Nucleic acid binder design. Structure first.
Ligand code: ZN
Lengths: 136, 192, 59, 126, 79, 49
RNA sequence: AGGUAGAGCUACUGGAUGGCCGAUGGGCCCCACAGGGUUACUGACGUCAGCCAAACUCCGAAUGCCGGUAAGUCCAAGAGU
RNA sequence: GGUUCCCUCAACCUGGACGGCAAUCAGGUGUUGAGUGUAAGUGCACAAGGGAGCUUGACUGCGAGACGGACAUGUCGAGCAG
RNA sequence: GUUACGGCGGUCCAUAGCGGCAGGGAAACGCCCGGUCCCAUCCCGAACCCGGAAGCUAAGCCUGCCAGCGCCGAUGAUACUACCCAUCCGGGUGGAAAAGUAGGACACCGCCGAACAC
């Protein structure tokens, strides 16, 4: 699970979920990629589950890139307490995803197994998504 | 290498702005700008379907001959504005060129062949820069990975360019990096 | 040069064991010094009692 | 081919003087009512001017290059007294009677102080 | 548990008091600030706590001299 | 108190004209300093009480 | 006069993805020492490409605010002080 | 603290007895990344940062004009005389 | 009035800077010679100061040409936004960036003084 070594500020406001992505909206490293169509917070637990799913399908060969990182912490206050008395301690790390962003990439010799592998990863994510290539 | 300019009909716009450009797109048009050494930019319009057909069969660096109110003009496609989601063509830049002029252009490099069965191919740089005539720009650049064994850095200086085409980018870029194929244990440790 | 902060400094004269003499200026109140090694004496420049004790009693 | 390694003392001396002349000019300034007396010194001559900083114009100027100053058979400081008296005559011929002194960066003393006291006994007050 | 925060200090009402073209008297405060974000210009002085005030009546005018933002006072010609 | 309050008095008319502070570790002795004395009308030596 | 929305980062402080090069360490063999190559190894520094931030900013709006001015409403706003 | 005058750091490269990453010395590159008693922010290389000489304005009688303000408080200030 | 000339200033202070190549000593500007005198070094005439005129334009300074780096930078399009339509999509009128592109650019302006000419 991806976790930053240190963040300057531990308790932060919620990342904004407006607009579409400014940068990262194209495939740079691999041949195929997963492009987002909705806003969400992608947790590191979902990223780990979504790249293991890609691994189990291509088995040996091929390379996988992850283009997003869980940098921003979301806090949760302790259970069954009344409102008030401070702000809760951070629990899970998310990545602010906007439509147009490319999340994962893959480089595999054949097409059908690479497109099938990415579909298994999309079903582990809380958003609509599609498979894109390097061509216009 | 010689090319034939693609005929397109360009109408001079009457009104410009965000309201007028949105209306033009809804009618199936693309705003475009014709600057260059003419040094008096013309704000033109192009048929959306006909313009994109030229790009499909000739690439982004497509030479064009335009019909502005009855007068021809050689133009080059300089840049395209594309919506990330809808994959539109919201805008286009056209640069005036004349025969014999040298222009610096980014062309795509394509990987072909079948290397050693125990290797994985990873192309790093998608495009490289060249400098050719107005009508003598290659539509693609081709590299071959055949019998290439283990780790070899194919370099931008080893790409076979046609006559009259000079590489502009530095000759030490890493274009294709053939590497030993990852194993099931290399997949698992990479990314956690 | 400030007045009363520096060591007293007077021209001197060096005389070597090879007969060489100079005319220099140093801090020594004596006015002259004698040295048995100079630029003309030391072997490394020129390239040329324990020694005498073994060369007299024993040969 | 000869490639010098550092900075000649001439460059070090020149940039250091302009550095300490601008630090000076952060206070003194020239006005038509009360002009500024700028002095420039070299190993051979000495120069003065009356500069109006409001519009950047020079009122009067005396220098040691003049033929009559060269005839003096003193030392360098003897010519500085001559140069100081000339600027005081020229200052008062243009209605100027009060000035402010701009020593130009150089230490106030010796040749510079000889010129200023020559222009003080001659009528100018500063 | 509780929160260790909750402190703050009184707002000091800093800022530009007289803007460009605005006629002022002598000794009138123009800018209140901490450092010299604005440097004094002609007929403007700097106070003990880096306050810019007018040294002569006129009209405020902001400028720039040698990369520094400055505040200047220009006179108003009598009818 | 390390830094106590001290009163400086004129050494001519013995008038207590000023009050200030000093560190009685760095300055164990009575502070001697010249200040304007309004009664005398001129700068006079002022010494701590 | 601003530093918000936006955007940008070899423009700073932090976070951070993948290549290339290669000091430093486990070393291995160089019979023990200085004396050279080797990594399913760890990898500074630099560099190529893609990014992120309420308490990041080389940048930077629309509005809003302060002042001047020309008119408008003007048998009324039933205004302002 | 006041005033007058002078100066440019941090880091990196190279050469030097102990001496080493790092002490003191020398040359080069270096425009602010160092430093500003003390938190942060706004500033400061023109230096508000480093060094030296003299010194007590860390004054007395006053203070046009302003900032901020329920009120009581609080804050800036040219200039006159001793 | 002419100059490959010397001072003092300005520009909402790099379009002016860094780097490279080739050149200049008429007066001035410099290096330069020396420490008797004013003056000086937390040691040192290196620096500051003073008295000069054997050498040199090798450096500073100045002139010409370069677009390698830094710098300026549109038009158009987009992001964003005030007001207004719109039953959860979105749109209209007005304003309008940052990045990038075509390009610009090896400064411009003013007052005195020199040598020569008139
Ligand atoms: Zn008394």
């Amino acid at each position: 699970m991806l976790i930053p070594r240190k963040v300057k500020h531990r308790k932060q406001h919620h990342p904004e979920q407006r607009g579409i992505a400014s940068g990262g909206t194209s495939v740079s490293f691999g041949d195929y990629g997963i492009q987002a169509l909705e806003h969400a917070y992608i947790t590191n637990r979902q990223i780990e589950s979504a790249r293991i799913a890609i691994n189990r399908h291509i088995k040996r060969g091929g390379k996988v890139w992850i283009n997003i990182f869980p940098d921003r912490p979301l806090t949760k206050k302790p259970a069954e307490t009344r409102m008030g008395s401070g702000k809760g301690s951070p629990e899970w790390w998310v990545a602010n995803v906007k439509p147009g962003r490319v999340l994962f990439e893959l480089s595999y010799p054949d097409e059908k197994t690479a497109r099938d592998a990415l579909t298994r990863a999309i079903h582990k994510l809380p958003i609509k998504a599609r498979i894109v290539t390097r061509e216009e | 290498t010689a090319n034939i300019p693609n005929k397109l009909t360009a109408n001079v716009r009457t009104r410009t702005g965000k309201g007028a450009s949105r209306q033009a797109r809804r009618d199936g048009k693309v705003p475009a700008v014709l600057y260059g050494h003419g040094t008096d930019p013309q704000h033109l319009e192009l048929n959306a379907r006909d313009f994109a057909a030229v790009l499909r069969s000739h690439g982004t660096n497509a030479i064009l001959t335009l019909d502005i109110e009855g007068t021809e003009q050689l133009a080059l496609t300089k840049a395209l504005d594309v919506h990330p989601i809808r994959r539109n063509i919201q805008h286009a830049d056209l640069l005036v060129v004349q025969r014999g002029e040298k222009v610096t252009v980014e062309v795509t490099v394509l990987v072909e062949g079948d290397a050693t069965p125990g290797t994985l191919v990873t192309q790093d740089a998608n495009t490289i820069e060249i400098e050719a005539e107005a009508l003598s720009i290659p539509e693609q650049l081709t590299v071959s990975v055949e019998g290439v064994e283990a780790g070899t850095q194919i370099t931008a200086g080893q790409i076979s360019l046609p006559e009259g085409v000079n590489l502009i980018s530095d000759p030490e870029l890493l274009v294709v990096n053939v590497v030993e194929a990852p194993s099931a244990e290399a997949l698992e440790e990479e990314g956690a | 040069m400030k007045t009363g902060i520096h060591p007293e400094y007077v021209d001197t004269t060096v005389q070597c064991g090879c007969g060489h003499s100079f005319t220099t200026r140093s801090t020594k109140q004596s006015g002259t010094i004698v040295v048995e090694v100079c630029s003309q004496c030391h072997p490394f420049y020129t390239g040329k009692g324990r020694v005498a004790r073994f060369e007299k009693r024993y040969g | 081919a000869h490639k010098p390694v550092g900075q000649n003392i001439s460059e070090v001396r020149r940039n250091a003087r302009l550095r300490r002349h601008a630090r000076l000019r952060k206070k003194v300034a020239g006005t038509a009512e009360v002009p500024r007396l700028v002095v420039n010194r070299s190993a051979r001559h000495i120069h003065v001017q009356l500069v109006n900083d409001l519009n950047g114009t020079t009122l009067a100027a005396a220098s040691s290059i003049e033929a009559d100053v060269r005839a003096i058979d003193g030392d360098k400081k003897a010519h500085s007294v001559r140069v100081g008296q000339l600027i005081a005559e020229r200052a008062k011929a243009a209605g100027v009677e009060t000035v402010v002194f701009d020593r130009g960066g150089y230490t106030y003393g010796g040749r510079i102080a000889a010129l200023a006291d020559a222009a003080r006994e001659a009528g100018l007050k500063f | 548990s509780s929160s260790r925060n909750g402190r703050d200090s009184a707002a000091q009402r800093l800022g530009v008091k007289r803007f460009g073209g605005q006629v002022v008297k002598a000794g009138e405060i123009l800018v209140r600030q901490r450092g010299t974000h604005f440097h004094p210009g002609v007929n403007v002085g700097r106070g003990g706590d880096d306050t810019l005030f007018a040294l002569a009546p006129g009209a405020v005018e902001f400028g720039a001299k040698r990369g520094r933002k400055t505040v200047n006072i220009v006179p108003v010609a009598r009818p | 108190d390390v830094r106590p309050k001290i009163t400086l008095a004129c050494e001519v008319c013995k008038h207590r004209n000023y009050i200030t502070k000093k560190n009685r570790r760095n300055d164990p002795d009575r502070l001697e300093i010249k200040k304007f004395c309004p009664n005398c009308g001129t700068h006079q030596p002022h010494k701590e009480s």
